[model samples]
Target: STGSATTTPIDSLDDAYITPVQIGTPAQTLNLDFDTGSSDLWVFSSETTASEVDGQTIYTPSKSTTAKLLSGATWSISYGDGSSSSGDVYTDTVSVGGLTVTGQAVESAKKVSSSFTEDSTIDGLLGLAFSTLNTVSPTQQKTFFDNAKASLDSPVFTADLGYHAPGTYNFGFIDTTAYTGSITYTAVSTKQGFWEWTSTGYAVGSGTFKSTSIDGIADTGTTLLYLPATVVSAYWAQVSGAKSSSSVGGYVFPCSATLPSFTFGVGSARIVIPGDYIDFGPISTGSSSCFGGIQSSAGIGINIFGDVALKAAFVVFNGATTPTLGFASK
Candidate 1:
């Protein structure tokens, strides 16, 4: 028994990876990276100088009969990694599965770096995670969800991150077949665009760490779970027969051993980080190693809950409504 009508089968790039939704009439496929850290739909264009561009999938306007460009508006984005790109804005008819939306706002980069232009497989990024952290503002922009909400069968957007298996990512609609039971939701808090929460304390195995009060936000754009340095080291010490290895960057314990189940108390919500995530791959650094999923970035901004935490649950972004976020099981 399903909850709603399942949409058409959208193609996957890596069997599980979500396929690119065509943007433009007669359809032009563009691979998108659904990012929560920022909001913007950017693609490489033919107008972009070939030397400045890298492995990105370039949109050849001449090849597509329906492609359109917004000549007046231009854009440039800079990342925390010191990478940036400059481009122009354009409008086109975008299609995801059977759903089609017209006049979708798209940014076409004119000058791109090697890091972005080199990756041909990764055409563009779709900022569907949250509107607060969205690179584009409501006054200046409308997202894929904002444009397609009216056409959708339901006013909902879901993402399933297959971290272990091909790491599939989806947009527009949720795949009910991938999840079971009812969807559990948490009210969105407007803070720093991240899914922020106040944790009561740490719960490891049967014992709970009462003294330590850790508060932070959850982020999908990040790849690792960043925690306070002191908290990370203290937790690392608790692992059975675990020792800091110089060969492995992070804390290295016996991978086969039964690690304790650690839970982060977020107000009323109790989020548990599985053992496999704890016994992470060792980093090559010489100092105390970093955990696989949970690593320590001392100087970084806030506590970031990356893909490791996200993979454990079905995350939903409901920006169309108020500043609210949702979660479920898959």
Candidate 2:
């Protein structure tokens, strides 16, 4: 079986993306961030403290007849932003699009960080990374994709993110019409439990490609495109007034400044991110300083090709015996 779902940006800035997911019996639909960076299908639920609950929807297992608590099982995840959530586990019917997975492990949040509470658009996160990245204690649980892979027509899923519009996440089969030209395949290193790959090189605006082998992960959960400091600086240098600001926390420039496009290579294919996408909106509530979509990866350890980059190409997450990634211009 296969499934497809529409993924929409949470806000105008495209700070995050979310898709509808039905959990439990009778089906409680919740908007969840389909995160490719981590592995754990967790949700804000009845167990979560009221203090942590804001306007976000909470999953109530008690309403489902199929719900069953997993004795002694608990899960917790801490993001790079310092936000975290933890709670017990339960197995229940979970559905995404038209695909259904019975007894899917659902981590019910009992405590959540303030960041999550403030982000009312997302009810939880549906991890798409390797099951090895799951933080569930006692017994590591498989992700929804992992559990559903066996029954899928093909053990793969694709992400088609949009700049300011809604895109899609397709399971099992590739829609050839969704992209242009041919797909460029690349080997993925699952050692890091991420969709890690080495990009051939990059170019700033109309500059030449730098033939540098940069290692990075395709993370839909993240917001910006983080590359090596040298590459990030190169792109910013082309902008009239761009600099790494200590006050703004990252690279910022005049909101009206002319920005340059960024290009990255995957094998022989090149994906271009329009200059407008780089102007990731104002740094603050009506501030003239605009934050950049591309930032330095110096402090992040590995580079991250997040939503900013993913929106420029079609990304395939192949979960076969030997995992591989595919990219295509859209």
Candidate 3:
């Protein structure tokens, strides 16, 4: 079905975006992160230890007449940020943006990482990645998008993430009015459960745009832009008084430092990330020290173009041939 829904940023975090989706019969709605980084559609549920959960909206399967436990099935997922959740699987009716999918795998969490337990605003994760990355054990579960693809006008979803504002997640159809100029596309590697693409080059500030092949993922759930240490250093070198601070985590620079805009290649499509967005959050409020949005991926291996970079452009998660990603300015 052709439909879309609004995704709002968390006021406290301002790091990720959340969208509302209904689960089970009679519709128990939950605010979930539309994560392109993972494939399990899991949530905090009644099975979760009450003491461990904060104010997250827990899904109640018993209340849904259509909900059915998947025999011998279980799911667990860990994030790049160290947050994790695990539990049994349940098949239920899940709908988003008025598009309904019957027998959707609704993973109910019995356990969660301390990081997830502390977050009250996010209830669960709605994975937008392909079905191959689903975390269900014994048998793999198809993603909601995979289940609905045949019926969709187009096999795609557009993540129009906004800056400190609400944006629409358009399904089946791309909203032309939401973006300007031509939509440049690059072939994506879906083997990693993410919208992975390679950058032809990158530039720091108005300096010369150098060519460097960098592989990375466009992740909505992530908060920062992670690149190779060398690349991060190249950008940081342009800023005065920038250095790593363990007390504040990652790289920090003077608030007065003139931040440089970072632009990376996407199949000849240069996706520009503004300088202000790279300042990120301050090391501490009322301090002149701010964390650099771009940091070294180092041990993580794969670089991440997180919310900081994703919000700078309109992105299309096109599940067509080669599973390409389309980018354009908003």
Candidate 4:
């Protein structure tokens, strides 16, 4: 039997933050957000004059004597939130969890949008979702996994969300000691770019919505799980006494009631969401209420499995062996 993996959204920080890691023999650190939706390692630097870098934590080459700049190669990234940043490329010794690697590729942004600058705590984002999106150029690329994979003690990485209290992020070697059962590895999809797929259907309570099944992708970049309007309405209708609320831009229901458990079919895997997750923020809005997974995205073709859904399972990205995404029990 596979144990469930729980995931929660990384709380936004009020000021820029960076974690220390050893890059080769010398110790160094980088500003990063533990993101599971995409793969890549980026940083902010003084050389970047973009507006997004205003409140972001920028790295000083002088801080680490071994840092090297890749003069001609510049990088830019655009996120789903419409946020973007641009900077020059650099290679240096990088480390995490006392593990260090040399000549690791990283992007140092020079320009960024308001979204990147506004968050004082969010100086940069660290994509832990998968290894596919780790490089700027698809043809010539290297990911954080590529550097760390060969050096890790085990061929595993564990994300200990509960280790650092409520909001801190933790990563590195997969701690089999933390889990009680055997790990179940899901085959990665043979797809291009980020590993994406479509859902067959969704089940709410004991009722199944076959017609609502449509094309959707699992995203580590997004905070909330978004579904098609038709699917959202259909699933919420099953709650014993579900009611729509405007406070959180979703629906809510009595927390004590026997609410239905929702599950989505991901190929051979059935991803389930319990009642507790359905009940979101602020006890005033019917604490422990059921929420509609679907939101109006207008023309955006498919649904997105965001942080809320990701927390339920151990996800693996095997870009090096096969350009596919894998899911398993924690």
Candidate 5:
């Protein structure tokens, strides 16, 4: 069976980009964060402690006649931000946009961290990372994309993430009308289960492009861009009142600071990020203070080119062969 779909990305508490997905027969729909940073199709569901699942939508597998428990299978996952969930597994049909996959493993969360229970709007997470990263116990689980790839004309999906606006995630095929200019593609290394790659160098504003190389991952679930500590310090130094606040835990600057644009290099290609993207937004109680989107990746496992950077361009996640990211002006 062959199919394709398009999904709109909903703005989430100023933190994540969410999309709609359907599970089981008769289509039980849920708003899920399409997280390329992790793998697992998990949702707040029937198995969850009813009292603990306040404010968020949950899937009732029992309501779907086609749903079936995977006898003793379980899964648990934790994120860098300390958010986590654990649950039982069920086999059911899952559809995103319009593409549908039969027998997709859906993780039904039975326990969740405070970080998850506090946010009632984010119903669940739909991981788009390599299936090899799925955390199911005993037997690994395949994601919807992996289960449906053979039916697709090309094993690819595209993320048109927006900045405090609506975006779309298209599956199976590329939409030429969604972007402009020649698309630049670079090879990705997923040995770590992330869309990791290296940049030849980067420049601030119209400054001369630096030749220093850097490595990072393109993460949809993240809201800001993370760079090396030295790189972050340099970018903030350009801002007159920038400082690394111990409380803020990141570089912050005066809102009035005139920011400089940032650019990075890929294989024979360059991607430029506007100054405002790096400026991010306000930090806290003070209106004049703002957090720099380009922060230091000090304690993180890897650098991240999060939504703040990806929103500037159209991105293609190619899974046909060597997974690569294609970028073009939107």
Candidate 6:
């Protein structure tokens, strides 16, 4: 058996991707961010404070006969952007696409950060990373992928993100037709509980591929691509009127500035991000300056190949005994 789901961008800028998920026996559906960077399948449920709830959907575990509280179990998670959520734990039937996992740990958010409350797009997050990164106390829980791995036809899942469009996440098998040419496989380092791997190198638009190895994580949850300062500087230098603004917080340039494409390597394969993708929407509503999709990861501690990079190609997150990642042009 396998699971397949369509993930759609929440906004015009492709700020975040969300997929519908069914929770509890009655199957209350909620749009959730399928985050590959963290491991905590949490939701905005009855446990959440009313003041914190906005237009987002909320999961009602009390309405499901299959729901059972895991006494004393608690969870809390914080993101790199300083957003956080925490609450109690409950086990229930959870389904994504066509896959069902009985007794899946469902963290009920009792507290959520302002960022989550303000964003009316996602109800909560469904972590797809390894179970080792689960934040539940006393006992960590397996992610939906981990719980369904054995039953899947193959121990693998793929991410095919689209630009300003809907994408698909497939579990158990890779859709050969979704990509072109062949996939370039690389060993994954799971010690950090992330889909961490080494990138061969990168190049500014139409430039030579640097022979440097870059260690980074493939994170679907992150909105932008973050790399070394030197590489980011090189890319921006090509665009006229681009500068790192302390006020705007990162690299920003004139909205109408000509942008250059960004290319990164996987093994010998090179994936290129279109120049337009780099011109992230304006810094403000009607602002003449725009932010760059690629920025420095120095403050982030690790380079992150987020949606900007992931959407350019088909990505495979192999959950084999010894994990591996596959990249291919879409």
Question: Please, what is the TM-score per model?
Answer: 0.75, 0.99, 0.96, 0.72, 0.94, 0.99
**Model 1 steric clash total:** 18
> Tens digits of per-residue lDDT for model 4 on 1-330?
011223333343111223433332255454466555556567777676755555655676656677776667766677766788766767877766445567876777777787777766555666654555555653334665556666555344444332112322223334455444444444445344444656666777677546344555556556556777766676667766666566755666556555556676655556666645444443444446544433444345556776555555545444355444445444
Which lDDT values do the candidates have, in the order given? 0.59, 0.94, 0.88, 0.55, 0.83, 0.94
Q: Which ten residues in a row are the worst by lDDT in model 1?
A: 1-10
Q: Candidate 3 regions off by >4 Å?
A: none
Q: For model 3, where is the 10-residue window of minimal lDDT?
A: 9-18
Against the true structure, candidate 4 has what lDDT?
0.55
In the range 172-205, model 6's lDDT, one tens digit per residue, is 8899999999999998999999999999999898
Error of 3 at 120 (Å): 0.3
Candidate 4 TM-score, true structure as reference = 0.72
Give a tens-digit lDDT track for model 2, residues 1-330: 999999999999899999999999889999999999999999999999999999999999999999999999998899977899999999999988899999899999999999999999999999999999999999999999999999999999999999899999999999999999999999999998999999999999998998989999999999999999999989999988889998777899999998888999999889999999988878878989899999999987999999999999998999999999999998
List residue ranges in candidate 6 displaced over 4 A. none
The whole-model C-alpha lDDT of candidate 1 against the native structure comes to: 0.59
User: Model 5, 1-330: lDDT tens per residue?
Assistant: 444444444433247766778898778989888888888999999779877788888899999988999998999999877789999999998988778888999999999998788877788998888988999999999988788888888898888876557788888888899888878888889898888878777888788878887888888888888989888887777789899988988888888888888887776677888887776567765578888888889989689988877888888889877789888887
Model 3 agreement with the true structure over 126-217: per-residue lDDT tens digits: 98887888989999998888888888999999888887789888889989999988899888997777889887889988888888898999
Error of 3 at 132 (Å): 1.5
